Every structure is written in structure tokens, then in C-alpha cells.
Amino acid sequence: TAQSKRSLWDFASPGYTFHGLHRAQDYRRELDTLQSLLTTSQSSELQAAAALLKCQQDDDRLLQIILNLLH
Amino acid sequence: NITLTKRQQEFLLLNGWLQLQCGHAERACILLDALLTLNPEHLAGRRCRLVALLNNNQGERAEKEAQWLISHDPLQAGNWLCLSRAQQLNGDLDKARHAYQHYLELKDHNE
């Protein structure tokens, strides 16, 4: 049922999102801190999460260069 | 030993939830698995991953997660809807109907 699926998505929703007066600075700060924190772990699952965060942190830096070239 | 601050827990939860909306079920599960490895009692993260498990096609895992949530709050209707959906994905239709009846008995019919 579509209604049950919507009720499921409503149940999964945390009901809020990123907040604060400087969520742009706070996101890059927590991202950089968390990726170095989880890298020190021995669990493969935590290492996978750290590697995923590092990838997007640097894949975006590649896209920023493209945007500058494209103005 | 690693301990997550509240902001770091929030970071993983919200990035996982937003990636799940972006159709990146893999990214969501990796992030939410990491959160729930370090904070196993993070209820909102458990709910988000359970629905993500239902979308990465991991029904047997989803059933155990729903049973985990039910034992923490047996009166929360949404836990029983999650159990019903995992069980019908796993082919146990008759059990999925009993779980759905529990969902109806507990849900807020005003929502």
C-alpha cells in the first residue's frame, strides 16, 4: 500500500535537519573531524564510513575546480 | 575506544537519512551502520536503517531490527508496521498480517 509506504517513510524520518547559525562551517568541520576520527578505528565498517566521507570531501574539491573553469 | 559527540551522531544520522532520500541506499547503510556500531541505542538511527534495509532488499535483517525496536517500545505502532513489511518481503505473509493488525491496534488513527 502506498499509504503504508508513506507511513514507513514518515517513521524513518528523524523529523529535523541540520540547524544552527553556521551550518555550512559546522558541516565541513564535523565531516573533517569525523573522517579522521573513524580512520583510527580497526572495524572495517567504521573504516568504510571514513573512506566514504574522505571520498566526497575530495570529490567535491575536484568539482569545485570544474565549476571555476566553467565560471 | 571511539565515542561520538551528539553533533557527530547527528551528522551520521542526517547524512544517512538524506542519502536515503537521494536513492543512495548503500551510502545510507554504511553511514547508519557506523553510527549504530558506536551508539547501538540511537533509536532514530535504528528506524532510518530499518527502512533502508527494506530498500536495499535485506528483509531478514530488517525483521531482526524490527524485533529489536519492538522489545524497546512494544507500544510504538511504527515498529509493528516495519515488522509487517519485512515479513511480507521475506514471504511470511500470514505473519505479516498479524504484525499489521498489531500496528492497527496501536496506531494513532488521527494522523
Residue numbers in the entry:
A (entry chain B): 50 to 120
B (entry chain A): 2 to 112
Q: How is this structure described in the published paper?
A:
The export gate SctV (YscV in Yersinia) binds substrate:chaperone complexes such as YscX:YscY, which are essential for formation of a functional T3SS.
The complex crystallized in space group P21212 with the asymmetric unit (AU) containing two heterodimers related via translational non-crystallographic symmetry. We solved the structure by molecular replacement (MR) using a model generated by AlphaFold 2. Moreover, this groove is largely lined by hydrophobic residues and allows for the binding of YscX’s L57, W58, F60, A61, and P63 into distinct binding pockets. A second interface is formed via the interaction of YscY’s N-terminal TPR and the two longer C-terminal α-helices (α2 and α3) of YscX. The helices of YscX are rotated by about 90° relative to YscY with the binding site containing the hydrophobic residues I3, L5, F12, L13, I31, L32, A35, and L39 for YscY as well as L80, L83, L86, L87, L95, A98, L101 and L102 for YscX. In the crystal, this helix is stabilized by interacting with helix α3 of the neighboring molecule as well as the same helix from symmetry-related molecules, forming a 4-helix interface.
